[PDB]
């Protein structure tokens, strides 16, 4: 039960602070560490013993503890600093265990808005022949990484049968997302056209398919 703000943001070159609040049985009476976790890596130790920094950690990382809370500090922050940050300590109550914070996600300001590119595929003939039908909508190269997706049967929406992914950062530092609509071949051949409609930053892109015309 260690409390951190869920997210923090600043421009490259500036300073940030991440706070972590607890009780006297944990932060108050023990030593605080900070861990950094870049996407898909082992957590790395940034700061230990409240303010000590291991050999091999840049000196623009700084730590402090005051009473019942602790704060991590990063100066001259570069884009490579974008990660989830966790505080950790020891709880000295009868519980007797190692306790962590919720994490805060540090994002760095400024990358240009990138409007999303949308590809829509209808069911393949061999899949229809296997008595199933899947419409696939692929969305790539958008920033920032938040889109909503809406399906249309002819002209009216359908909510049933839809599966969409969480958007995820691609290798080129933009975002991607997949949405799948699962139908029977009877339903598929039953309509004039189907539409996938991607809404990103108050703008709309919409692609259409029809039962091979």
């Amino acid at each position: 039960v260690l409390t951190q703000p869920p997210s923090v943001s600043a421009a490259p070159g500036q300073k940030v602070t991440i706070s972590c609040s607890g009780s006297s049985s944990n932060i108050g009476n023990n030593y605080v560490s900070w861990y950094q976790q870049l996407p898909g890596t082992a957590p790395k130790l940034l700061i230990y013993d409240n303010n000590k920094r291991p050999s091999g950690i840049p000196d623009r990382f700084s730590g402090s503890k005051s009473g019942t809370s602790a704060t991590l500090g990063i100066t001259g922050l570069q884009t490579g600093d974008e990660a989830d940050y966790y505080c950790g300590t020891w709880d000295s109550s009868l519980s007797a265990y190692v306790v962590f914070g919720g994490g805060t996600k540090l994002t760095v300001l400024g990358q240009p808005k990138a409007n999303p590119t949308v590809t829509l595929f209808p069911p393949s003939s061999e899949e229809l022949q296997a008595n199933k039908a899947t419409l696939v909508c692929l969305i790539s190269d958008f920033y920032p990484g938040a889109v909503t997706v809406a399906w249309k049967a002819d002209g009216s929406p359908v909510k049933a049968g839809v599966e969409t992914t969480k958007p995820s950062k691609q290798s080129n530092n933009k975002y991607a997302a997949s949405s799948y609509l699962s139908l029977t071949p009877e339903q598929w051949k039953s309509h004039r056209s189907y539409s996938c409609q991607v809404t990103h930053e108050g703008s709309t892109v919409e692609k259409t398919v029809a039962p091979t015309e």
């Binding site: 082992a42 595929f121 061999e126 692929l138 992914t165 799948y180």
Partner: protein, 221 residues
């Protein structure tokens, strides 16, 4: 000069046990404590327990007390973590980490890369591969998108390459989706020029090692 390496991914049905291992270079007999920490997807880390060197005493988090068991074989420099009566909530990333000293009350300075255990009610199934054909609906600007649908497989992961490895620049393989059937499905797209489309031959190479199936599938208009 001390490195940690855990065992491979595990897939388990509810109610079963799982025993993960962690191997240390340097060492090999320890003079440092070692802990296990899990992280559920989109969650803060969670300490499970740890083991003191020499004396072998163990400490477990209150939450896992009684269904987690931590042990060490000193002659091989290896510690184990065993979690029993698995539920779906136990699905997480599982790290081992060493302490900068002999007490679990101390900073964890070195961590292993991590290992996943997945708890699901599904059985292991190979995927079906379907072509996502280019067509006139995907052709603009002298480019054309085409791809592969890898449908209904368990468990992760799957491997998709193109023309047996030749095509790479201009290839996107999207992260999977998890259906309510508890099966996975993903898509892999390669962006190429409009002109080559008919002359050029494109083949996707899908590999699902868990069910020992390799599917190769041509994608044509």
């Amino acid at each position: 000069q001390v490195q940690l390496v855990e065992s491979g991914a595990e897939v388990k049905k509810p109610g079963s046990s799982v025993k993960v291992s962690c191997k240390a270079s340097g060492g090999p007999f320890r003079s440092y404590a070692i802990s296990w920490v899990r992280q559920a997807p989109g969650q803060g880390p969670e300490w499970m327990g740890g083991i003191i060197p020499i004396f072998g005493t163990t400490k477990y988090a209150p939450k896992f007390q009684g269904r987690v068991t931590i042990t060490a074989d000193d002659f091989a420099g290896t510690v184990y973590m065993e979690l029993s009566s698995l539920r779906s909530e136990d699905t997480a990333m599982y790290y081992c980490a060493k302490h900068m000293g002999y007490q679990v009350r101390e900073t964890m300075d070195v961590w292993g890369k991590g290992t996943t255990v997945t708890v699901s009610s599904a059985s292991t199934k190979g995927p079906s591969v379907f072509p996502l054909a280019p067509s006139s609906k995907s052709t603009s600007g002298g480019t054309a998108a085409l791809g592969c649908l890898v449908k209904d497989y368990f468990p992760e992961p799957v491997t998709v390459s193109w023309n047996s490895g030749a095509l790479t620049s201009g290839v996107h393989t999207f992260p999977a989706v998890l259906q309510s059937s508890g099966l996975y499905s993903l898509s892999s797209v390669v962006t190429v020029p409009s002109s080559s489309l008919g002359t050029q031959t494109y083949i996707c190479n899908v590999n699902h090692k868990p069910s020992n199936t390799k599917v190769d599938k041509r994608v044509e208009p």
